A paper describes a structure:
[name] is a key pioneer factor that regulates zygotic genome activation in totipotent embryos, pluripotency in embryonic stem cells and metabolism in adult tissues, but the mechanism of its pioneer activity remains poorly understood. The DBD consists of two modules of Cys4-type zinc fingers, a carboxy-terminal extension (CTE) and a fushitarazu-factor 1 (Ftz-F1) domain. Unlike many other nuclear receptors, [name] binds as a monomer to its DNA motif, TCAAGG(C/T)CA, on naked DNA and nucleosomes. The nucleosome structure is stabilized by minor groove anchors, which are electrostatic interactions between arginine residues of histones and the DNA minor groove.
The structure of the human [name]–nucleosome complexSHL+5.5 was determined at a resolution of 2.58 Å. The structure showed an extra density on the nucleosomal DNA that could be fitted well with the crystal structure of the [name] DBD–DNA complex. The other regions, including the LBD, were not visible, presumably because of the flexible nature of the hinge region. A prominent feature of the [name]–nucleosome complexSHL+5.5 is a reorientation of the DNA by ~50° compared with the DNA path on the canonical nucleosome, demonstrating that [name] binding leads to 'unwrapping' of DNA from the histones. By contrast, the structure of the [name]–nucleosome complexSHL+5.5 shows that the minor groove is occupied by the RGGR motif of the CTE loop, suggesting that the minor groove anchor by H2A is outcompeted by [name]’s RGGR motif. The cryo-EM structure of the [name]–nucleosome complexSHL+5.5 showed that the TCA extension DNA region, located at the 5′ end of the TCAAGG(C/T)CA motif, is recognized by the CTE loop. The [name]–nucleosome structure shows that the zinc finger domain binds to the major groove and recognizes the AGGCCA sequence on the nucleosomal DNA. The [name]–nucleosome complex showed that the side chain of H2A Lys75 (loop 2) was flipped and formed a new hydrogen bond with H2A His82. This flip was potentially due to a steric hindrance between H2A Lys75 and [name] Asp159, because these residues collide in a superimposed model of the [name]-bound complex on a canonical nucleosome.
Numbering used by the authors:
A (entry chain E): 40 to 135
B (entry chain F): 23 to 100
C (entry chain K): 85 to 122, 131 to 178
D (entry chain H): 35 to 124
E (entry chain G): 14 to 111
F (entry chain A): 43 to 134
G (entry chain B): 24 to 102
H (entry chain C): 13 to 118
Write the structure that this text describes.
DNA sequence: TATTGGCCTTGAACGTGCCTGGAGACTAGGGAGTAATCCCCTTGGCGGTTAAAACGCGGGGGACAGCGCGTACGTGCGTTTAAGCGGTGCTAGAGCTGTCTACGACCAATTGAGCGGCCTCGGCACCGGGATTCTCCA
DNA sequence: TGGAGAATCCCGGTGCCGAGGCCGCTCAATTGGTCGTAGACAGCTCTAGCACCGCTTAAACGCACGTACGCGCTGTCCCCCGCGTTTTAACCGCCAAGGGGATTACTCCCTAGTCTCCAGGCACGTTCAAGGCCAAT
């Protein structure tokens, strides 16, 4: 058995060496279509549009997680909590 | 609904790429909410761009222009 | 003459013709929010008589500025000018 | 060349018994110039995207929808449409 | 009605906006309805900001709008705060919070 | 040791006037500008605008620093809070 | 050495306007460095604008354009 | 007899194409005879620098073709290029390997 | 229209034995278009500020100085000035 | 003596002259608006793996609260320091006008550089596979 | 420090799909002459930026002091992590039917361009009522 935290570091090293998308494609397409439903009914999407949206979303989430990690480390912790996300989004200027 | 397609392992992988070591139990709902807000804004701008052009199909150019409008310029899709 | 006391008027002060004395008295009273306890010779006899006569003749209170902004003209400017046309 | 006359008329329409200072007037002029530049640039980009050589009311409406937030965008679109309809009626 | 603002029912100059659109290198041609729409939008935004500033100045017993009132009006409104979130106002101060 | 600080905060958040002496700021501005070009000349309005922009920027930075300090269970701001605020802000 | 003209009481006033209750003793040097970095980046672009049009006097519109280039739009100084 | 403007200027990027883009882009009423040359030279210089850094990054990983990850590595490992391309996301680029020191085992 | 031919020529100039992929060319095309738009917009703004109807090498030089970092701006200015002088020398 | 008065400073509202830019009218040419056609291209089914999501559950390390202690930061007062407000003197350089030429727009032939389509073969991804090195504990 | 034992790297084999090298033609880059004005250039008027200087007084600096706050330590209990079974729906391949994007003749209304008339908008100089300051009281 590996002590808690070794597999986390292994995953961190592994997922920072790759460039593939980390979200399953079909649920993301369904979510995108459901969100777009409220703007105009019976919309069609090119595959490139959904791919670009997915790429942008993953990049944004990775950056937000980096900021959240910095905020959590500031408060003498190792575990990220929602309050760190709120602080990062507040300082960034996203949340009012 | 479809938001549960963004599962716990997916958010875990996204956090792992971001360097996060330990994750709490209430992180995933916050991630789902922020992702919904971001997607809503981008899709609203893209749909407005599509509507102005007298079209029923969303192209990659609309997404690229919408992302550029938010200061999130994206390369590789034209 | 100035209707508040009976001295020579100096001009348009918080609503109509008044003198420098009554203008000064009103501005001190309003700015300081002063409260006391109760003719030209008797114009200095009691603040109450002069003050109540000033409010009675119709000269207005809101003409004084709470923030005491300087210069310009107040809302009664068009009215002052129309009255001054005569 | 400034917007002082028009801003003063708008203020007299809104608050008939409230004045404005010189520095506030300068701030209002800067605000009007900034908003004009933003909307005009967005309209120009919209016209360039669709391979059009003209800027019309459609591009202005789309730019207003893209820039202003929800209720502001709704009311601005309503006011602009009313103005264009009245002008066209003549 | 001779002036285009009279036809459009506006208090902003349609002709000056048209001239600025023409001599600004935005497009080769400018439609006849774009200046009207733009002037109406600008007038509405100015009226909104001025109304909020006047209300802020009338809360306190003041009778003249200074930049502090404009800053207070913009900061306390959710829509205008988002519209002008990256704008510095001369002699406006900060919101009396914290 | 908390009353005077609160009174100062109240008065300086209601104050809306400038908070730096003008002659030292003018000297600093000219000293910085002398590096890029020699025998430079300035208008008064340019120096006023520079001062006002600097003051607004510093006030905003201090607000963010106070937020970062409060996040860490403290009431005293430290250089680490300023550094974290500028790092997340994206300034380099 | 004119940076010391930004005295400690001035920095304390600026912090008080920001809602700060307690200030450490190492804040002041960091604030001075931050202010110098900001002013350098603004003044560089202001002088670059001034060199265009063959002028020897820096105008307010130069600093206004320099600020607007950095997403720090400022109202009340013309333009 | 006809000579290309790029050959006169000694460039690889096109001068006529840049001139046409400047004319059609609604930037100025007139365009000077030397502006496209300057613009093309600047663009060529920037492209050459990025290509050099990306090629070195690709050679580091024992590859002979440049892929988006090499471009991202070259851009993010250079301070000036990173400052220039600060708000830009590269598709299929990834992130730089970076772990905080505290998170490491004691 | 695209910049693939010129990008390939520059790549062969700097790295003789080194290829590229299609996605990398897409990214480079986006990069070139972005830089072109930035410089052209800055030059147009500079021309409009000074009340002039022409964009010359001077506006390009000033825009390059305004938009690029220090060493990059210096090298770009040197290269552009050299190119303009070489172009003017011939006729 | 803390209250009368008299003279002095003040910042938006008003008049006046004049000039440059908006309004009206007319015409020519091209940009935008509709149809008709063509064919990619997007949506929708069906069935067989099989990798990924879901689930159970023991425990170990980390979040969180309580308490003690030392010094750094706040507060007050006497004493320097120099910022702030005038007045005066003296140009450097901004700001506008005139002349006239050098440069860039525009048009018509003319030519060659650069997109599209189509083989093809070499870099790169995938599998064993033993070799070697990270973790963990006792 | 030594021992299992998973995770990881250094090695060929292989074949497949995309990078990369031609052709033909069309369409955009080049040439050359003519012409109208944008901008270089020189000269003159006058704002305004920069120097000093004296006096007054509020900010800056120094110093003694004591208490509130930061930071380290200890204990305990919640709750996330690592791993081994079940359950599920994401991928992949194929296919077929339209739906909508892209292209092309074509025609007609919309907007640029020029010339003339004259009032809106800017620059001033001048109120002028209201807040401010002073001595005699
Ligand atoms: Zn009287």
């Amino acid at each position: 058995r590996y002590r808690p935290g070794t597999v986390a570091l292994r995953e961190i090293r592994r997922y920072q060496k790759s460039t593939e998308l980390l979200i399953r494609k079909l649920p993301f397409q369904r979510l995108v279509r459901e969100i777009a439903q409220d703007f105009k009914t019976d919309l069609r999407f090119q595959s490139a549009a959904i791919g670009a949206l997915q790429e942008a979303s993953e990049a944004y989430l990775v950056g937000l997680f980096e900021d959240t990690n910095l905020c959590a480390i500031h408060a003498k912790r190792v575990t990220i909590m929602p309050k760190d996300i709120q602080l990062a989004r507040r300082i960034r200027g996203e949340r009012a | 609904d479809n938001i549960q397609g963004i599962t716990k392992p997916a958010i875990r992988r996204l956090a792992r790429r971001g360097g996060v070591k330990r994750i709490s139990g209430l992180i995933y709902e916050e991630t789902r909410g922020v992702l919904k807000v971001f997607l809503e804004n981008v899709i609203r701008d893209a749909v407005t761009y599509t509507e102005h052009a007298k079209r029923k199909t969303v192209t990659a150019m609309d997404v690229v222009y919408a992302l550029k409008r938010q200061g999130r310029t994206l390369y590789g899709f034209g | 003459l100035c209707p508040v006391c009976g001295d020579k008027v100096s001009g348009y002060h918080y609503g109509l013709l008044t003198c420098e004395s009554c203008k000064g008295f009103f501005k001190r009273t309003v700015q300081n929010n002063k409260r006391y306890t109760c003719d030209k010779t008797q114009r200095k006899r009691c603040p109450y008589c002069r003050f109540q006569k000033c409010l009675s003749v119709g000269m207005k209170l809101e003409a004084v500025r709470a923030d005491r902004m300087r210069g310009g003209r107040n809302k009664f400017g068009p009215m002052y000018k129309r009255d001054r046309a005569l | 060349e400034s917007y002082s006359v028009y801003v003063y008329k708008v203020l007299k329409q809104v608050h008939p018994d409230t004045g404005i200072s010189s520095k506030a007037m300068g701030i209002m002029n800067s605000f009007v110039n900034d908003i004009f530049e933003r909307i005009a640039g967005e309209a120009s980009r919209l016209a360039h995207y669709n391979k059009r050589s003209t800027i019309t009311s459609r591009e202005i409406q789309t730019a207003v929808r893209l820039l202003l937030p929800g209720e502001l965008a709704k009311h601005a679109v309503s006011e602009g449409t009313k103005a264009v309809t009245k002008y066209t009626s003549s | 009605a001779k002036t285009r603002s009279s036809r459009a029912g506006l208090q902003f100059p349609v002709g000056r906006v048209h001239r600025l659109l023409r001599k600004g290198n935005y497009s080769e041609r400018v439609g006849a309805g774009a200046p009207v729409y733009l002037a109406a939008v600008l007038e509405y935004l100015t009226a909104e900001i001025l109304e909020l500033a006047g209300n802020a100045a009338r809360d306190n017993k003041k009778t003249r709008i200074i930049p502090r009132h404009l800053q207070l009006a913009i900061r306390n409104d959710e829509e205008l705060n988002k519209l002008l979130g990256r704008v510095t106002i001369a002699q406006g101060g900060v919101l009396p919070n914290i």
